[PDB]
Write an enzyme that holds these catalytic residues in place. Structure first.
Site, short mmCIF file in Angstrom:
data_model
loop_
_atom_site.label_atom_id
_atom_site.label_comp_id
_atom_site.label_asym_id
_atom_site.label_seq_id
_atom_site.Cartn_x
_atom_site.Cartn_y
_atom_site.Cartn_z
N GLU A 8 -15.37 33.78 20.25
CA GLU A 8 -15.28 33.85 18.82
C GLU A 8 -13.66 33.98 18.04
O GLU A 8 -13.53 33.46 17.04
CB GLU A 8 -16.30 34.69 18.16
CG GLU A 8 -15.99 36.26 18.38
CD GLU A 8 -16.70 36.91 19.76
OE1 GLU A 8 -16.84 36.18 20.59
OE2 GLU A 8 -17.00 38.13 19.47
N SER B 265 -5.78 31.89 23.75
CA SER B 265 -6.01 32.51 25.07
C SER B 265 -4.79 33.25 25.64
O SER B 265 -4.73 33.73 26.65
CB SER B 265 -6.29 31.31 26.07
OG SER B 265 -7.57 31.20 26.22
O1 LIG Z 1 -13.59 26.80 23.99
C1 LIG Z 1 -13.27 27.60 23.03
O2 LIG Z 1 -13.85 27.69 22.04
C2 LIG Z 1 -11.87 28.11 23.11
C3 LIG Z 1 -11.66 29.67 23.57
C4 LIG Z 1 -10.50 30.29 23.50
N1 LIG Z 1 -10.43 31.67 23.88
C5 LIG Z 1 -9.08 32.15 23.94
O3 LIG Z 1 -7.90 31.58 23.84
C6 LIG Z 1 -9.20 33.61 24.36
C7 LIG Z 1 -10.60 33.89 24.50
C8 LIG Z 1 -11.22 32.69 24.08
O4 LIG Z 1 -12.30 32.57 23.49
C9 LIG Z 1 -9.46 29.58 23.32
C10 LIG Z 1 -9.48 28.35 23.06
C11 LIG Z 1 -10.63 27.58 22.87
C12 LIG Z 1 -10.57 26.10 22.55
C13 LIG Z 1 -10.91 25.56 21.17
C14 LIG Z 1 -11.63 26.29 20.24
C15 LIG Z 1 -12.01 26.03 18.90
C16 LIG Z 1 -12.13 24.60 18.66
O5 LIG Z 1 -11.35 24.66 17.15
C17 LIG Z 1 -11.36 23.73 19.53
C18 LIG Z 1 -10.82 24.28 20.99
O6 LIG Z 1 -10.19 23.40 21.72
C19 LIG Z 1 -9.86 23.58 22.88
C20 LIG Z 1 -9.20 23.06 23.78
C21 LIG Z 1 -8.65 22.80 24.94
O7 LIG Z 1 -8.43 22.08 25.88
C22 LIG Z 1 -8.90 24.37 25.58
C23 LIG Z 1 -9.51 25.12 24.44
C24 LIG Z 1 -9.92 24.92 23.52
#
Ligand SMILES: O=C(O)c1cc(N2C(=O)C=CC2=O)ccc1-c1c2ccc(=O)cc-2oc2cc(O)ccc12
Length: 256
Positions: free
Chosen positions: A135, A39
């Site tokens: 994605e 992000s």
């Molecule tokens: O929501 C998700 O898909 C996700 C989406 C994004 N994201 C970006 O950072 C830029 C656009 C976007 O899709 C970033 C992080 C996460 C995210 C995770 C993504 C994949 C997974 O392996 C685990 C994740 O865990 C997360 C945790 C958080 O506390 C906060 C977030 C996440």
């Protein structure tokens, strides 16, 4: 070496680049290793939006539905009846890491290919946008789509927020939003003394990817610009925000 020790403690790989803009002193640890930017790319996306619009143009209202909503829509789910302005969308993207807000802003600037083009234009040949929210986070080791490095993210963040990729009013908006980030209290902010202003943007993805990029203003003197990036090992690995806080403390010690 303190960085080595932190990798050992949290079973993780760290990527660290920091630059003191007052002295040009640097602290580097795997500064050129690639990580999913996650992000953190929202900060560079708003940079480009601000470049491509007048401050007044940000007042344009964007309408959307539950169909433009994605996995994580903290502000954007509250306003599907009325829409939101571009300014409100930049706020939600930066400060709450609203994925929907990010995707609409991406749409307005022309999608990932046009973000990349604008990033290349400001001198960034490393950061590689390919995909929308969410994605982009799904990066296996050895791939380079939706990655950057700690050196590149600091150079690009500095270019928009601090140098001449934006005019002062727009740099002020960017830094205002990023100073008022809500997602970062246990990361870079926790590794810095109180009274030191911090503008940051966090990211999290698979492989336990956990990132924070920031500008840090000590009372005394020029800002520091910092990327702390991390990843593991396991695809379904957990991260620990403490590793970023502690890496940040080591950086500030090495520069103080
Ligand atoms: O929501 C998700 O898909 C996700 C989406 C994004 N994201 C970006 O950072 C830029 C656009 C976007 O899709 C970033 C992080 C996460 C995210 C995770 C993504 C994949 C997974 O392996 C685990 C994740 O865990 C997360 C945790 C958080 O506390 C906060 C977030 C996440």
């Amino acid at each position: 070496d303190d960085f080595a020790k932190l990798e050992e403690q949290f079973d993780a790989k760290l990527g660290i680049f920091a630059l003191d803009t007052g002295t040009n002193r640097t602290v580097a640890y795997r500064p050129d290793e690639r990580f999913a930017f996650a992000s953190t790319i929202k900060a560079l996306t708003v940079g480009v939006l601000l470049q491509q619009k007048s401050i007044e143009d940000l007042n344009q209202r964007i309408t959307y539905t539950r169909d433009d909503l994605v996995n994580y829509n903290p502000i954007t789910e509250k306003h599907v009846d009325t829409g939101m302005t571009l300014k409100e969308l930049a706020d939600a993207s930066l400060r709450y890491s609203d994925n929907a807000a990010q995707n609409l802003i991406l749409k307005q600037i022309g999608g990932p290919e046009s973000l990349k083009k604008e990033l290349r234009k400001i001198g960034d040949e490393v950061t590689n946008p390919e995909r929308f929210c969410p994605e982009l986070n799904e990066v296996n080791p050895g791939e380079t789509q939706d990655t950057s490095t700690a050196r590149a993210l600091v150079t690009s963040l500095r270019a928009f927020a601090l140098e001449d990729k934006l005019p002062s009013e727009k740099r002020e908006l960017l830094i205002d939003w990023m100073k008022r980030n809500t997602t970062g209290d246990a990361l870079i902010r926790a590794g810095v003394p109180d009274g030191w202003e911090v503008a940051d943007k966090t990211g999290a993805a698979s492989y336990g990817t956990r990132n924070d990029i920031a500008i840090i203003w000590p009372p005394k003197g020029d800002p520091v610009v910092l990327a702390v990036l991390s990843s593991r090992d396991k695809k379904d690995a957990k991260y620990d925000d403490k590793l970023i806080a502690e890496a940040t403390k080591v950086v500030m010690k090495a520069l103080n």
